[PDB]
Structures are given as structure tokens and as C-alpha cells.
């Protein structure tokens, strides 16, 4: 049931802007801002070039924290700028592979990852979070085998 959110295409000019009463894309409530950090944490997990780099330890033993740090540095754009575009976030991912991973990502595979972070804001702008919870539930199907095996017993 259901279907993938993307396969290669998404947009080419995606971006977001704050209201005239604000100085950053940050939310008015810290309870609602939580939906946004969760949402980006899910999109960075779907990038292929970063996933291979932590499995091959191209960043050393610290690459396991550099993995979760890549969403943390992109989230900071929304906390300090009143407008952000997919081109801003993409450079924040491309440089995060070259600053210590010694890996270039000229395949543009970071483009569709940047456009997804932009739409997390659009959903959180009207209290929606259905895709942020969906990716969080679909993320667990391999953590029960790529980190700690478990015999399932689900039956609805």
C-alpha cells in the first residue's frame, strides 16, 4: 500500500520565506518546531552518497555522529535566516561530504534531498506532519536488522 514520494524529480526552484513579522523561518512554538527537526532527520536518511560514506567509515569512527550532524547544520538555516532555498541546503550537503568525507557528490543526488527539507516547512506551517511521522515509522523496518536483530510477532 502507498507509494514513494519521489524517484528522481521533485522541483528545481523550491524555497520558503518567513512572514514580515519574523526574522527567521523558526516556528512561533517550540512544540511545533519539533515536527521540523524530525522531518529533516528523515530526508537526510534517504540520501545515498552519505549512507555509503558512514557504512565505509570514510569520515572515520566519528562519521556515525557526522551522519546526524548533516541534518543539524541544515536545520540551522531556518533558525537564522528568514528565507532559504533548495540551492542553499544543497550546498550545505555537498560541502558536508567534502569537508571531512573527502567525497564529491557532483551526481546532483543532494538536490532532491534539499527540496524535501523545504516542504517540511510548508507542512509545519499549517500544523500538518503526516509525512514526517510516515517516514519515521518506515525507518524502523531496517533498524531491527541493521543494528539489532529481532523476531517479529505482529498480527494487527
Amino acid at each position: 500500500s502507498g507509494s514513494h514520494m519521489s524517484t528522481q524529480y521533485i522541483d528545481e526552484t523550491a524555497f520558503v520565506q518567513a512572514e514580515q513579522g519574523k526574522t527567521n523561518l523558526m516556528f512561533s512554538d517550540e512544540k511545533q518546531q519539533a515536527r521540523f527537526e524530525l522531518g529533516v532527520s528523515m530526508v537526510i536518511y534517504k540520501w545515498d552518497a552519505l549512507d555509503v560514506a558512514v557504512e565505509n567509515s570514510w569520515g572515520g569512527p566519528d562519521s556515525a555522529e557526522k551522519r546526524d550532524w548533516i541534518t543539524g547544520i541544515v536545520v540551522d538555516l531556518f533558525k537564522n535566516e528568514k528565507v532559504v532555498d533548495a540551492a542553499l541546503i544543497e550546498e550545505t550537503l555537498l560541502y558536508a561530504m567534502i569537508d571531512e568525507f573527502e567525497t564529491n557528490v557532483e551526481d546532483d543526488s543532494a538536490l532532491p534531498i534539499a527540496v524535501e527539507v523545504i516542504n517540511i516547512y510548508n507542512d509545519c506551517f499549517n500544523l500538518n506532519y503526516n509525512k514526517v511521522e510516515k517516514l519515521y515509522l518506515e525507518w524502523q523496518e531496517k533498524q531491527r536488522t541493521k543494528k539489532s536483530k529481532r523476531v517479529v510477532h505482529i498480527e494487527g
Binding site: 519539533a34 527537526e37 524530525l38 555522529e65 536545520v75
Partner: peptide, 26 residues
């Protein structure tokens, strides 16, 4: 040539875990 960009290097205080943001968002 061009701007130095906002490109950081490495940190572990701003990082986001798939659960550290879910235990507050869910």
C-alpha cells in the same frame, strides 16, 4: 572564486537523531 559559504566542518551539539526529534514531535 566566490564566497566562503556557510559550510561548517564538524560538530555534535546541533546534530539531530531520528528519535531525539520524534520523542518531542510524535
Amino acid at each position: 572564486s566566490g564566497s566562503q559559504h556557510m559550510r561548517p566542518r564538524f560538530n555534535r551539539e546541533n546534530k539531530v537523531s531520528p528519535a531525539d526529534a520524534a520523542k518531542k514531535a510524535l
